Amino acid sequence: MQTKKNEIWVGIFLLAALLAALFVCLKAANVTSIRTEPTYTLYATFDNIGGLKARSPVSIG
Amino acid sequence: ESLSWMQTGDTLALSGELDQDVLLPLWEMREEAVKGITCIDLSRVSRVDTGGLALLLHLIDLAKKQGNNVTLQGVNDKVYTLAKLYNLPADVLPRH
Amino acid sequence: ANLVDMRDVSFTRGNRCIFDNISLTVPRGKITAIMGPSGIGKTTLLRLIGGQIAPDHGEILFDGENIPAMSRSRLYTVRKRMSMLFQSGALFTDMNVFDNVAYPLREHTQLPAPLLHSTVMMKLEAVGLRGAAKLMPSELSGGMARRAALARAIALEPDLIMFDEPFVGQDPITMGVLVKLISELNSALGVTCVVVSHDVPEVLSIADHAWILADKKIVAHGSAQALQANPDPRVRQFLDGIADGPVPFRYPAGDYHADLLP
Amino acid sequence: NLVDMRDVSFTRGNRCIFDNISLTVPRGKITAIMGPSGIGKTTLLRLIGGQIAPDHGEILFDGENIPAMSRSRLYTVRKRMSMLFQSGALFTDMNVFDNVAYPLREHTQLPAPLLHSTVMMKLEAVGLRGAAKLMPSELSGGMARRAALARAIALEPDLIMFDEPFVGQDPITMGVLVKLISELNSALGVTCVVVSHDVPEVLSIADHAWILADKKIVAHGSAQALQANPDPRVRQFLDGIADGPVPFRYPAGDYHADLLP
Amino acid sequence: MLLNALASLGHKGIKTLRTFGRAGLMLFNALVGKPEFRKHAPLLVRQLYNVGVLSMLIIVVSGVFIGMVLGLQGYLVLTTYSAETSLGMLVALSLLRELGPVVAALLFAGRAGSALTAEIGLMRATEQLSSMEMMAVDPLRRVISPRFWAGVISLPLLTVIFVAVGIWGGSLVGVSWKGIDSGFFWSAMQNAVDWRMDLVNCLIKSVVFAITVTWISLFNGYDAIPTSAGISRATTRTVVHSSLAVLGLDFVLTALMFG
Amino acid sequence: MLLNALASLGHKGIKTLRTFGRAGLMLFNALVGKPEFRKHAPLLVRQLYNVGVLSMLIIVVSGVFIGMVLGLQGYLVLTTYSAETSLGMLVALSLLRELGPVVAALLFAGRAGSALTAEIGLMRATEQLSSMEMMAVDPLRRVISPRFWAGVISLPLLTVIFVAVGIWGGSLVGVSWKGIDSGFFWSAMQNAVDWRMDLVNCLIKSVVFAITVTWISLFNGYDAIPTSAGISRATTRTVVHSSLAVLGLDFVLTALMFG
């Protein structure tokens, strides 16, 4: 022993830091990837939308 | 620079000169060339290089699997001189 | 008769003159040794026969044909029959040793695929490196890399092999191998070896005609026996390691009473 | 005896070099330590200077431990060694006159007119007095090696170690370096250690030969009793023969299985 | 001084014409010649790993480090302006007009441009290029020609990776703690981006920035003294010459097709 | 797959810890020793000529070109809001915040940083540091201690020349080529009247990016294989490691000073 046991002990410590590194970059980079929304649309009627374009957000309150 | 080889009396008579640039009519037609050849005699040769000697070694393995052996006569000086330099083993055609 | 027959040629640089007036011949079937002291352009002498640089006014022959008066396509038809060997080994490091030997034996050739594998294994046994074919060339030593490129030089069966100072800084264990393969391949293939190594008990033991280039000129064109028994202060200075003589042991200067005490 | 390497053993992380070797050199004599290429002939002189520490063993510096004084004490022993290297060990950012006087400006306390009288005459021992204001890059292979010999005698050492001298050179300058060792051994009284592999010239000036083979000590004879040694490994390091204990040919690797198929 | 004053300046002008005269002569023989298509087909794949694949690690990890600093500094200058929805015209417009083929070319000369000069310099000290002349083959068409075409098609390909990661890197620092949505950031980015204005013109200036970088890396690797100091002197020489050829051509390429 | 896959990771996990082990131990045994001021007084001026004086032919002649492209590209983008008043605003603010100590760091590590690795690595090839170690003189105080101090105080001295060539380099397009001389150009340049912003924070980033460049430039030159290929390998890896040390730390130094 002691010629390969220290390599796996530092080996499993680096994968413990590698999987913890992916948990830091998980809330900001993984956006609109796993959190989906149901798809049902509505219809409106206006005379002029002004400077409104596609992908414009709606809001209530 | 010509390969004037013939097979009538079951003896492959190689003529011309064996080099590394003229080997196409003798390498492609090599399966049906030797089937029951027991003696190979060559006389009209001048010098055999490393590429020309590599073709003679491949004809021994095609004849050893048939069942019979083959003996070679009419050796030049340039054939056995390069054979001692390249250190050929006892599992190939010997110097007999 | 001869093979090279180098006439009066020169090679002068921008500041230093290397060759001034030389006359040298090389026969067929013999080993020519062109040795001399260091400092002079002994490497550039083999470059004139190949044609990599532009020499001065002169005329050198290669089986009757003038070497520097050739075109681009005409020069490559005669440069494939020399295959000179360098000092450290000019072998490629982007491939293994098995693909390094058959580098000219694959591009301009007519050999098929199963016959090419048998040609390299026959040429590697002539130098003793048959087992060293599945490794990187960077793992080899200095003396081991000279024999790996020696099998590359005998791929296309040349007629004028030019060694660029072999066994000059190796061990005496591998020095007996490199001095044996030159005399063995000369009698078995009929090739002409050109050795420019400055090893007077090693190159003279396998050569029959030596050349001495001390003062940028041909001063001794004797054999291996008449060279050691030639009464001359310049030729005997290079033999047997003579320190004092025509070569200045001290640096040429003066005013010894003006730089020590003041 | 200056150094007494009793049971020194050097072993790296991949390949070992020395395993229980023994070296013995007396004072005022020339001892050549010969050996083939591949083995650690360069690392043998590193253990005497103290640059690297061995795993098991010690070097007895005539009653003094070498690797046990690494705290402001090895520099007081290193001033009288002056190890000479194979290539140019002199600096390239200055002239060759400041390379010889480089140990004289930090160790010895000498005035400026007195320094010009003790450095310029040191170049006359090697024959480089006229080449004093020249750059080290302008020197040749044999001329730059003689400039390091004047730097080696700048502090009057007692054990000079020549790490592979007069190798890969012309026989004109090869006859110069063999004469300068004999002139500095009798007229000065120092100990020279040569680790070169050139056989037919180092035996004429040395008094003790140590041929290394199979990474062990196989020869400890003198310069005259070495040629009469009935040993297959010692005589193979002599005058050129191909076959011997070490094979120049690679072993059997099934040559019949890859030639024809 | 007046008579001896031109002895040091006039001699440098002769060697300057011999330096640039040998670079154009080497590139003319390396390109115009025999159309080796089937022979140079495995040579282009081998010379694409050390130029395109091995230099891909530095540009990817610096693409997120060029957008997270540009997108964070660009937020403070647009404070008290009510223009937080116009971030796409600053992080994506400056990475395509000003940045892009300029910053990635400075990293190409350090990783791929510096190693290409030392590769030929190590083969010149061992005289591997001189051994190709003895094998009856052209040395300028076997070791120089696959290395020129592999560098001229990699730097326009590595420019798009520097832009798309840097655009996503600006969106990573954009919606991280500011509270803005993903609908306002990708709204102003679509404006003033069309054909032959910003996307095509970035590819136009990228291939010009790929010829002038690889020309110096192949010339100094071919023109070097075969010793231990000549390789290291020509290795650092290509980084200074490419820094003045990329930034020096920035003023020329801006006057044509502004934007 | 639990033991065979982790066998190769152990060889690249211990050597990475020993990589930073000899890097911090070499710099520690260079300044905690005896202090001499008159002994390194001629040695500091010699190393300042190679690092700081010879690097003026790259930063000064290219710093005008970076200042020129900030005026051409910064004019057509503001044709509807302010084409003359805000012309000198984005030039002086960008060069004093993120273009100062970062863009000049790639030019400092390309000439004075890449050649510093090859200078130390050349001494270990021909055994120059080993001959100096054989005397009583410390080899870590003659080639490391005056060379580290000649790179720490050089890059802040070279940043102000890069700033002054960028502000004046943007003045050729301000006072000329359909512009005003000093009415609307120089009046909008002194908006940062505070001494903390753009003066202290610009000098803080220039010192931090000077230690992290000269540390890797003296580490790859001190730890290299003594051959012809080991010096050229450490010269290439110096430019890659220094470019990620000035771009990866640029996001770190901005997040606490600009947020």
mmCIF file of C-alpha atoms in Angstrom, chain A residues 8-43:
data_model
loop_
_atom_site.group_PDB
_atom_site.id
_atom_site.type_symbol
_atom_site.label_atom_id
_atom_site.label_comp_id
_atom_site.label_asym_id
_atom_site.label_seq_id
_atom_site.Cartn_x
_atom_site.Cartn_y
_atom_site.Cartn_z
ATOM 1 C CA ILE A 8 -7.360 7.400 -4.938
ATOM 2 C CA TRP A 9 -7.739 9.419 -1.717
ATOM 3 C CA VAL A 10 -6.662 12.565 -3.561
ATOM 4 C CA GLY A 11 -8.573 11.267 -6.596
ATOM 5 C CA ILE A 12 -11.946 11.071 -4.866
ATOM 6 C CA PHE A 13 -11.219 14.470 -3.278
ATOM 7 C CA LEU A 14 -10.829 16.121 -6.694
ATOM 8 C CA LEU A 15 -14.102 14.671 -8.006
ATOM 9 C CA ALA A 16 -15.705 15.934 -4.793
ATOM 10 C CA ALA A 17 -14.432 19.392 -5.759
ATOM 11 C CA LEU A 18 -15.336 18.881 -9.431
ATOM 12 C CA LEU A 19 -18.985 18.029 -8.728
ATOM 13 C CA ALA A 20 -19.143 20.897 -6.228
ATOM 14 C CA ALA A 21 -17.856 23.215 -8.965
ATOM 15 C CA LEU A 22 -20.842 22.337 -11.170
ATOM 16 C CA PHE A 23 -23.214 23.187 -8.304
ATOM 17 C CA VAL A 24 -21.876 26.758 -8.227
ATOM 18 C CA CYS A 25 -22.454 27.178 -11.975
ATOM 19 C CA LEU A 26 -25.985 25.775 -11.869
ATOM 20 C CA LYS A 27 -28.306 28.693 -10.977
ATOM 21 C CA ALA A 28 -27.063 31.314 -13.469
ATOM 22 C CA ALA A 29 -25.994 29.345 -16.555
ATOM 23 C CA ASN A 30 -28.847 26.798 -16.520
ATOM 24 C CA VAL A 31 -31.604 29.257 -17.431
ATOM 25 C CA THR A 32 -34.625 28.222 -19.577
ATOM 26 C CA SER A 33 -33.295 24.655 -19.822
ATOM 27 C CA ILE A 34 -35.251 22.536 -17.317
ATOM 28 C CA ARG A 35 -37.940 24.969 -16.068
ATOM 29 C CA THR A 36 -40.590 24.962 -18.802
ATOM 30 C CA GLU A 37 -44.031 26.548 -19.030
ATOM 31 C CA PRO A 38 -47.385 25.270 -20.321
ATOM 32 C CA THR A 39 -48.461 26.550 -23.726
ATOM 33 C CA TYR A 40 -51.875 28.182 -24.034
ATOM 34 C CA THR A 41 -52.300 31.495 -25.845
ATOM 35 C CA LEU A 42 -54.838 34.320 -25.954
ATOM 36 C CA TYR A 43 -55.902 36.940 -28.503
#
